[PDB]
Tab-separated table of C-alpha atoms in Angstrom:
chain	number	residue	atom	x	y	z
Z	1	UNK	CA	0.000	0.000	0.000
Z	2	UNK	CA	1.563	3.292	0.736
Z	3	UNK	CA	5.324	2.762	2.303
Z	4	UNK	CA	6.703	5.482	4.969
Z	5	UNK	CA	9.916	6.450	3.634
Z	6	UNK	CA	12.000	7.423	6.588
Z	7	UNK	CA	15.665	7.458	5.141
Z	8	UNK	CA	18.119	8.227	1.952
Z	9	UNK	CA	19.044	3.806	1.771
Z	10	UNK	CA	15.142	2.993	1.961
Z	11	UNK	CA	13.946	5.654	-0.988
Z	12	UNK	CA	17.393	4.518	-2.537
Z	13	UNK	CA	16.681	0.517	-1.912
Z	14	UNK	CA	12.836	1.276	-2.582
Z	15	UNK	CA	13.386	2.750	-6.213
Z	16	UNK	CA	15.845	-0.378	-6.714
Z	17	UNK	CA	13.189	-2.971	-5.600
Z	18	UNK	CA	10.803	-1.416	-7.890
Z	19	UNK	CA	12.284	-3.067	-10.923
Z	20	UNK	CA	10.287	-1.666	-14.063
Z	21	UNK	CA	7.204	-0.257	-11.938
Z	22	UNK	CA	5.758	2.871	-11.719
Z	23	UNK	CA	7.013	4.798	-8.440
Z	24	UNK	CA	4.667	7.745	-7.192
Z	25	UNK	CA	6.277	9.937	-4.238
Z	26	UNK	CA	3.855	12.245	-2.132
Z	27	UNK	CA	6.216	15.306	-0.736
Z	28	UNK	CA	4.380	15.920	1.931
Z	29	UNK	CA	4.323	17.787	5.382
Z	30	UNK	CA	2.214	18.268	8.770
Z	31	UNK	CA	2.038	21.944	8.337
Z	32	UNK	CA	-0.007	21.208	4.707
Z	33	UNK	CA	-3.441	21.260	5.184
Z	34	UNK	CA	-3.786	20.159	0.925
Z	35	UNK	CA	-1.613	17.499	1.667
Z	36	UNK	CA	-4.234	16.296	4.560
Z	37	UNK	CA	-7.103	16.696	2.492
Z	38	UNK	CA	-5.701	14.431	-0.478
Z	39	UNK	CA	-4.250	11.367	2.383
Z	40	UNK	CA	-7.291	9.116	1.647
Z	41	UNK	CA	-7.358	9.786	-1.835
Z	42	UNK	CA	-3.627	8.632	-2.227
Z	43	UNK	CA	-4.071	6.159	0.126
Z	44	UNK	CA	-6.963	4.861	-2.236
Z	45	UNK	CA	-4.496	5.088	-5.405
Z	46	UNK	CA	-2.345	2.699	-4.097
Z	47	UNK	CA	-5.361	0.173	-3.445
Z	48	UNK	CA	-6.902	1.170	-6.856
Z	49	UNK	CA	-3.336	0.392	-8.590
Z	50	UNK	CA	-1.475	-3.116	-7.685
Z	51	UNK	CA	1.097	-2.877	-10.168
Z	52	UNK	CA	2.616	1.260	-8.892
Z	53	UNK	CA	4.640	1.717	-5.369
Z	54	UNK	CA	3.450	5.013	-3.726
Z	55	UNK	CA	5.678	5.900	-1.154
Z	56	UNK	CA	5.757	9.282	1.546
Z	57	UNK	CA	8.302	11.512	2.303
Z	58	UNK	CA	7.186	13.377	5.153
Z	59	UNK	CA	10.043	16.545	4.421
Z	60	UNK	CA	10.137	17.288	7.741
Z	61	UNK	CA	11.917	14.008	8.688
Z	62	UNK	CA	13.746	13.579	5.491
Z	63	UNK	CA	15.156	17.074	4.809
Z	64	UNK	CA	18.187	15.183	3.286
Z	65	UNK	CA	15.708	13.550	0.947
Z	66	UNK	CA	13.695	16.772	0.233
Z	67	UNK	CA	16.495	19.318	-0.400
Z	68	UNK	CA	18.118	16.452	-2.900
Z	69	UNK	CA	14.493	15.922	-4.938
Z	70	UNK	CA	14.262	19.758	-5.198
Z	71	UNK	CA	11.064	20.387	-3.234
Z	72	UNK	CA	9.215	23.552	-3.735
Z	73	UNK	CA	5.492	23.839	-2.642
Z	74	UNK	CA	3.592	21.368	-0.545
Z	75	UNK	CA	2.593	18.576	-1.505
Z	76	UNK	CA	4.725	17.694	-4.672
Z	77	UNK	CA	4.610	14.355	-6.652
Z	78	UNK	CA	7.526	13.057	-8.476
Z	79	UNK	CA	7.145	9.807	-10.602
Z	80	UNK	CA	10.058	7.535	-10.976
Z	81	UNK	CA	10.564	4.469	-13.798
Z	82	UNK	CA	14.016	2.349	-13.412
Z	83	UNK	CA	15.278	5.164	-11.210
Z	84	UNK	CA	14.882	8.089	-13.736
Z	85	UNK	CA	12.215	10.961	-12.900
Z	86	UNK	CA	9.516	10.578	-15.233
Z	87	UNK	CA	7.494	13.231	-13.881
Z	88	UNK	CA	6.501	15.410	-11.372
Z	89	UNK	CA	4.105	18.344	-10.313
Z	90	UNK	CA	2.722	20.581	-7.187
Z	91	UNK	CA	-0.745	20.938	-5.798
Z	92	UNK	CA	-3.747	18.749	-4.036
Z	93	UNK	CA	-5.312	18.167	-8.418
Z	94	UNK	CA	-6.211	14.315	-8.193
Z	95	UNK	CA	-7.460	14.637	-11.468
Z	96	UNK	CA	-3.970	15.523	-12.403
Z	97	UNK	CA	-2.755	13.113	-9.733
Z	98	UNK	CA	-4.337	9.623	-11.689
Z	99	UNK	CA	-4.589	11.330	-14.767
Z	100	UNK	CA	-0.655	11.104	-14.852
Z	101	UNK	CA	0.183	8.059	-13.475
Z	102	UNK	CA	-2.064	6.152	-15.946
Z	103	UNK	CA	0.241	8.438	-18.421
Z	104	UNK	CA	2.881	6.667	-17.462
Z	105	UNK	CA	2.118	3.379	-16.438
K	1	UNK	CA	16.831	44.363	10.635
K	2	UNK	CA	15.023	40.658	10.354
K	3	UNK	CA	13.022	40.040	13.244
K	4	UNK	CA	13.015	35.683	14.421
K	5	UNK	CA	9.431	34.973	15.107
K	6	UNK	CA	9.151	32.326	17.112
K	7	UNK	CA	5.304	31.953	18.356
K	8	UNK	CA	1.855	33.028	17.212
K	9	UNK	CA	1.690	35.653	19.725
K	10	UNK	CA	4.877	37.663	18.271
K	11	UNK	CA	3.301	37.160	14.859
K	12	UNK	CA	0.147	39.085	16.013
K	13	UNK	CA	1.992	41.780	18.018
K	14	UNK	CA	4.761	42.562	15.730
K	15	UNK	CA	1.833	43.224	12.830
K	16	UNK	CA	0.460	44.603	16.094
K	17	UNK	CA	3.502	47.112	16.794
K	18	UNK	CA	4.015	47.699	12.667
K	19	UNK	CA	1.923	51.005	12.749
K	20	UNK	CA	1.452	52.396	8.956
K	21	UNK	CA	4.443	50.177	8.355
K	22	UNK	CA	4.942	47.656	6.028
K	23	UNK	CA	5.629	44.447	7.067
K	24	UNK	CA	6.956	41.662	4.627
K	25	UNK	CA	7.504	38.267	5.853
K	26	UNK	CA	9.942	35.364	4.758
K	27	UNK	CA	8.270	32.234	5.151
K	28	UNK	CA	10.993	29.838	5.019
K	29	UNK	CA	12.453	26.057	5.488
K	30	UNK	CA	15.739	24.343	6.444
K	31	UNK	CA	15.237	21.800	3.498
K	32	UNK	CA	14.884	24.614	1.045
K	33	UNK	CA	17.806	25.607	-1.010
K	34	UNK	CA	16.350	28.690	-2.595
K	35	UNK	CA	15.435	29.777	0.811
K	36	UNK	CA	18.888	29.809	2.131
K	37	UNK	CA	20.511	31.366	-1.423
K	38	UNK	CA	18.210	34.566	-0.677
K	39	UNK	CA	18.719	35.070	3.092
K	40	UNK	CA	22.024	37.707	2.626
K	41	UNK	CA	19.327	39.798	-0.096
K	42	UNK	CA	16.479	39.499	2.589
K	43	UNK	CA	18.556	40.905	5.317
K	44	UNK	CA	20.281	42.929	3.119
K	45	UNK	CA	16.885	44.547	2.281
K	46	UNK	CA	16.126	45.481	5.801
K	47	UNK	CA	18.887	47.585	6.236
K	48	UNK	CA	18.270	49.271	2.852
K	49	UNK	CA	14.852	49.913	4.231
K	50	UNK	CA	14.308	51.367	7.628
K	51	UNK	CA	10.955	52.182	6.850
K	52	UNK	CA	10.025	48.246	6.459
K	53	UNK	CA	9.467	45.672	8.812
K	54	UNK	CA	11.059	42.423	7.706
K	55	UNK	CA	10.115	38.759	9.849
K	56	UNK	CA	11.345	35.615	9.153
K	57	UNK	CA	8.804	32.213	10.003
K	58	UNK	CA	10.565	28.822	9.924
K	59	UNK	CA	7.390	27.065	8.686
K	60	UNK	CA	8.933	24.044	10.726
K	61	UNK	CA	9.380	25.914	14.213
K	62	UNK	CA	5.432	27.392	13.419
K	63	UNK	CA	3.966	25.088	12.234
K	64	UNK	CA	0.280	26.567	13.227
K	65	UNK	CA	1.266	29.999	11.932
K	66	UNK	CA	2.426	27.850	8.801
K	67	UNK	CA	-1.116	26.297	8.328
K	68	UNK	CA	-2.872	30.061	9.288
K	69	UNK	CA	-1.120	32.168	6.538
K	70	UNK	CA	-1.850	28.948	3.676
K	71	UNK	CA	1.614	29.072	3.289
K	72	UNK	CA	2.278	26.335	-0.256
K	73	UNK	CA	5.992	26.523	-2.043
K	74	UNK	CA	9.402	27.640	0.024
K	75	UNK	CA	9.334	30.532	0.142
K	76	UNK	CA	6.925	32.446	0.234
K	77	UNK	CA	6.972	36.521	0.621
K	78	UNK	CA	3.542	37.468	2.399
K	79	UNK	CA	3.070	41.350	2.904
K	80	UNK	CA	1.038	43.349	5.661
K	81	UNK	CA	-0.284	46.716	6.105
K	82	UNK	CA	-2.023	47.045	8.749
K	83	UNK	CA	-2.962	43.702	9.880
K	84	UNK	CA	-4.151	43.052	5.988
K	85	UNK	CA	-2.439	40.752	3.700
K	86	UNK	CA	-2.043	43.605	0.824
K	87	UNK	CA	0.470	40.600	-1.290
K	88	UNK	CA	2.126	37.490	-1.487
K	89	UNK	CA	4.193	35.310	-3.957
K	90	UNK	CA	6.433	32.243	-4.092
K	91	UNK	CA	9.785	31.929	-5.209
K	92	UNK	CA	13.252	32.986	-4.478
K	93	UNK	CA	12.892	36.208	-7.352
K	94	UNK	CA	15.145	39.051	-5.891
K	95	UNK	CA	13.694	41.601	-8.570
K	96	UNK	CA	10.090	40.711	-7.895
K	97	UNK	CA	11.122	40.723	-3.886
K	98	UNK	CA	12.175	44.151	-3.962
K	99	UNK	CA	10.005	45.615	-6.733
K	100	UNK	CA	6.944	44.867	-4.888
K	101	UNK	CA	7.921	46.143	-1.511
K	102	UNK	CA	8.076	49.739	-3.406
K	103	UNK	CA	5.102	49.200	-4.671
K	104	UNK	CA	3.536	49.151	-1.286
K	105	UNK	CA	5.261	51.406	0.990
């Protein structure tokens, strides 16, 4: 379902183990009140889609993590395929959210 | 020259204390590069500007005056005359930074 990233080696080992899957990353922290109200709706994503490994980064506990990624706004979502970034936007849209992971699925 | 806010109460008093004045704020974030690449121009612009009040939030240390002002991408500039949020932006834009605080003094 949706793994809690807490360290460089597990998004590292994470993004290994994926093989040729889809990897969605929520950027997300406690002061984000958009990143609250899209949770379930992630959280549902991961249920909805078997073959795609969504993974948090809470920034706050992986500022290591989150300065390397680039972070800007709250919440962010970067898509990873064989370790290359695929993708990646800003903003609570989960129109946007599904619309681009079945883009790159 | 930039004043550490450290609580919700010093928030509301220094806007408080402000007057006429205008008060620009630096929301900002360990984990953000951008942040840290314009803190020299930030205070550097509150000693050009006497008549200016110039805070600085770590969005981390306040987190529930984080969540109050809606604060989204690091960082973001949010602007104050009395007590009313006149502007606001994101980004680490020196031009923009300084070309909107004359625009409201």
């Amino acid at each position: 379902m949706v793994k809690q990233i807490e360290s460089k080696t597990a998004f590292q080992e994470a993004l290994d183990a994926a093989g040729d899957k889809l990897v969605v990353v929520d950027f997300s922290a406690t002061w984000c009140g958009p990143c609250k109200m899209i949770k379930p709706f992630f959280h549902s994503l991961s249920e909805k889609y078997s073959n795609v490994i969504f993974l948090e980064v809470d920034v706050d506990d992986c500022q290591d993590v989150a300065s390397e990624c680039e972070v800007k706004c709250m919440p962010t979502f970067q898509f990873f395929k064989k370790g290359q970034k695929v993708g990646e936007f800003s903003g609570a849209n989960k129109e946007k959210l599904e619309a681009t992971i079945n883009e790159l699925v």
